[PDB]
């Protein structure tokens, strides 16, 4: 139970309030691939 509470607190703390929708910097490794090779849609 303490482990679950700590995980919930961590993932509530690392949340952000406001987001925005690259330039010449190639960030395809950090972002989600166009064709997913994994079973998780949000994994990078």
């Amino acid at each position: 139970l303490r482990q679950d509470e700590s995980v919930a607190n961590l993932f509530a703390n690392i949340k952000t309030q406001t987001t925005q929708a690259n330039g010449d910097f190639n960030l395809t490794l950090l972002q989600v691939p166009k064709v997913t090779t994994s079973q998780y849609s949000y994994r990078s």
Binding site: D4, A8, F11, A12
Partner: protein, 31 residues
């Protein structure tokens, strides 16, 4: 009627397609 979940299949819970968020979910149930 038992239903199949991602933490093993359960008896006594109904599936109603209701979505809650974080910091309102007591009984976190796993996954």
């Amino acid at each position: 009627t038992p239903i199949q979940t991602a933490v093993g299949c359960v008896i006594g819970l109904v599936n109603s397609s209701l979505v809650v968020d974080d910091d309102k979910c007591t009984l976190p149930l796993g996954q």
